[PDB]
Design a protein around this nucleic acid. Structure first.
Lengths: 44, 92, 271
RNA sequence: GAAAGACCAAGGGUUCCUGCGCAACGUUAAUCGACGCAGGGUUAGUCGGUUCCUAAGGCGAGGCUGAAAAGCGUAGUCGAUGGGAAACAGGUUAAUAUUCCUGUACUUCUGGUUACUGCGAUGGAGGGACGGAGAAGGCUAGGCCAGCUUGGCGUUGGUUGUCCAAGUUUAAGGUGGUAGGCUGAAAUCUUAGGUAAAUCCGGGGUUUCAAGGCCGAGAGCUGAUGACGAGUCGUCUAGAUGACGAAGUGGUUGAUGCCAUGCUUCCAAGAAAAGCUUCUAAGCUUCAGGUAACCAGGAACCGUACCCCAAACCGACACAGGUGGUCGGGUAGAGAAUACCAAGGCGCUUGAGAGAACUCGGGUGAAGGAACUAGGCAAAAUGGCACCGUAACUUCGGGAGAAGGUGCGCCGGCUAGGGUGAAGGAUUUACUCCGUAAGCUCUGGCUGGUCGAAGAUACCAGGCCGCUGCGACUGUUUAUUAAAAACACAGCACUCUGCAAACACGAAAGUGGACGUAUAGGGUGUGACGCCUGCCCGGUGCCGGAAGGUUAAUUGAUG
């Protein structure tokens, strides 16, 4: 019974990583929201 | 550098495995600085302990993670060299 | 042309076009380049043509459509199969090294031709300007712009018939039955394209389509009203609308040529 | 026991090991633990990654385009799931080992000295470099048997034997260039080509000859009078260690491994780029650079513990689930099915009783044999191999394993071969032929006898037939109540589209269609095949046609 999260660190870092977020305008403002909320991680 | 000979070697790692290995072979296990290539911890042993080194092998060690209140804390990842010498010639 | 025997239920209607003058393997490797499939998809990644997908990996063959080399005689080395055409391709060794692929005419074999400004207009395979070919002679691979290369009448067993010369232009009748004013400086090859029995073959089974890179075709009436205007209905319905594209253009008769830049070049439509 | 075994990737992140512990966690208890505390453990030129190269795709100087944000893209430069150097055996432990130790290699780089010396690019050629299927063959691992070594002599008949048990190992690499695969070879002259050149490749002409050449397993020898080895001896605390350490050979069967990126065949026509080989250009002062020899030296960084048919990953769980790839012994067997087992692993973390109804998963069942029921649902049955036989209908392939029937175990008697093998005879004198023989192994054919109720004796393993509806068939679908008659489909027809195509996605640039071109491409309906596919152009659409009425912005006469 295959589930919906099948982990891969490469697909992790390329969809949601730091450089993927800082490549686009909207991901840069994801990081500025998530830094304005004061979060410890901000890249998950 | 004239420095960096005194910064790479961080002390002899003391353990049962290091002791039996220093007795049986001529290999001495040093804790070394976490960015130290194999030849700058070969020149440092040849400079400071006055021996002839024939080989250095290295290994990064992950620091262990301890659980307590306020979460997991990690110890420092450290570095570890095995210094093979000529079969006499034990360093001090 | 061979007909397969019904030893299984899929071979019963396979009619197979077989040519033993075609060359057994190993295409001429300096005239091949890499070609990867699209899936019918855009640079937006969107499907912009339905029903493309899969198929066999194919190299693109650098077919010469221009026949630049004037006055250099080229013998025909061999005739090969081309995955990305319906015609066959002939490999031409020019008189100074220089191997090139062209579209093969009828009479495919190891003979000779020389694309030039004047030479041998009864040899199917010689390429000429349309000025100095006779009127009534069948041609193929016609340029529309001088130096653009062949564009018209180059599928398997296709040709145009040159019907009238006047001025700087020349009229030729296309396979679609429409008369086209084409320039007289632009070129054509004498003859008729090779694999003219291509239209006799029957695929035979559902999966001979899929290994051409053609994905299945689902009809409009099989869908829901959200998906197609032919859409829903209880039971089998008939698309109670007038028949229509999935994007709402009418299908069965409505003209869609709206160029208007090139209408003077077309002196008679398909009639 | 084709895993409940060993292993690699991913994912995890110390769960690994050892001391001390048992509160909590563990569906019970726990002295145990994947749990708590504290220590330790992960060693590389060769295994993986980085580094070199590129695919899909991404990003993209400038650039085109877009209210802005941005989109697309050229040069470029990222991007492996692919391509580019090379290590194997034996020891060693608490836990690492192709990493440490020992022995034996291999690859590549750097600095030297010697000698003769055309060096040089991203640029040109070459190569790398490749599909599906199907087979001969030749080997090898492995298996088995025999011999040989060591031990044994059987708690109840027998067991000094033609008996039993165990062991009978040895790698990479060097040398060899074999079975076998592909192949014309050399010299010379010339040249509108490979966007400059070229001694390279391509093209053309001339002369000589038949064997060159390039690959390529495996056997042999060497690695190796070494390591491993049942065990003996000795020391000390039932075992830890030092030295010594027997036999270590022959025959057969052999792969899904290797030759083999080979060969045959078919259409659906089967990655790029670099490393590598070669050619010159721009230049050098033709010292530099190249090419061999010899000598000395080097090969950085990162990952390595542990789990992967999982209690460590993904499922809120120590969850009957899921999770890519690799190996694969015996006997029966077609088989990797299955059954019993080997190496190896395990007793699935609540048990003890008891032996009611009922419930579940099974076993047998008198006499009936579908009376059950919506319906033979379930069950019961059939089940193999060889031989015999087999209907309608049929598109001539089928139907068909139709239907049905016979033989089957064991032990002998007589008898036909096959394959390995070789005593010796040939000469091109050796990895060669011919061909005796045993031994080993593989199939028969015919007759007997014999035991049981029963011989494909277990597991395993088709039930079949007769009318019809529907859909031609294989395929697909409502993840999680519908697998179908639904969708798809080959085939058919209509209609559009002349290329800057119709068409689609995009305020656009652009891109797909397509590096295709009317035998092509889009849309639509029908759905193999056979016979066919009738009437109607009023409505509505579509196509064409005059040119009369109407008719918009804009004009701006006149009142």
């Amino acid at each position: 019974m295959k589930r919906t999260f099948q982990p891969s660190t490469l697909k992790r870092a390329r969809v949601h990583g730091f450089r993927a977020r800082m490549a686009t305008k909207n991901g840069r403002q994801v990081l500025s929201r998530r830094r304005a909320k004061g979060r410890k991680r901000l890249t998950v | 550098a004239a420095e960096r000979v005194f910064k790479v070697l961080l002390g002899p790692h003391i353990s049962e495995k290091a002791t039996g290995l220093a007795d049986g072979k001529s290999q001495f296990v040093f804790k070394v600085a976490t960015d130290a290539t194999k030849l700058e911890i070969k020149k440092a042993v040849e400079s400071l302990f006055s021996v002839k080194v024939q080989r250095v092998t290295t290994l990064n060690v992950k620091g262990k993670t301890k659980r307590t209140a306020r979460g997991l804390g990690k110890r420092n990842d450290w570095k570890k060299a095995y210094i093979a010498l000529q079969p006499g010639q034990d360093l001090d | 042309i061979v007909k397969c025997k019904p030893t299984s239920a899929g071979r019963r209607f396979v009619v197979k076009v077989v040519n033993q003058e075609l060359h057994k393997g190993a295409p001429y490797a300096p005239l091949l380049e890499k070609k990867s499939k699209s899936g019918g998809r855009n640079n937006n990644g969107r499907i912009t043509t339905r029903h493309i997908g899969g198929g066999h990996k194919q190299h693109y063959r650098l077919v010469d459509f221009r026949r630049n080399k004037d006055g250099i005689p080229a013998i025909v080395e061999r005739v090969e199969y081309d995955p990305n055409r319906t015609a066959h391709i002939a490999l031409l060794k020019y008189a100074d090294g220089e191997r090139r692929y062209i579209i093969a005419p009828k009479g495919v074999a190891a003979g000779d031709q020389l694309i030039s400004g004047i030479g041998a207009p009864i040899k199917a395979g010689n390429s000429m300007p349309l000025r100095n070919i006779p009127v009534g002679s069948t041609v193929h691979g016609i340029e529309l712009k001088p130096g653009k290369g062949a564009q018209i009448a180059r599928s398997a067993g296709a040709s145009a018939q040159l019907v009238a010369r006047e001025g700087a232009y020349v009229t030729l009748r296309l396979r679609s039955g429409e008369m086209r004013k084409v320039l007289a400086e632009c070129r054509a090859t004498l003859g008729e394209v090779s694999n003219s029995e291509h239209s006799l073959r029957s695929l035979g089974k559902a999966g001979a389509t899929r290994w051409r890179g053609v994905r299945p075709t689902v009809r409009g009436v099989a869908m829901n009203p959200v998906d197609h205007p032919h859409g829903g209905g209880e039971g089998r319905t008939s698309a109670g609308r007038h028949p229509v594209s999935p994007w709402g253009l009418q299908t069965k008769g409505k003209k869609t040529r709206s160029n208007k830049r090139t209408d003077n070049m077309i002196v008679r439509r398909r009639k």
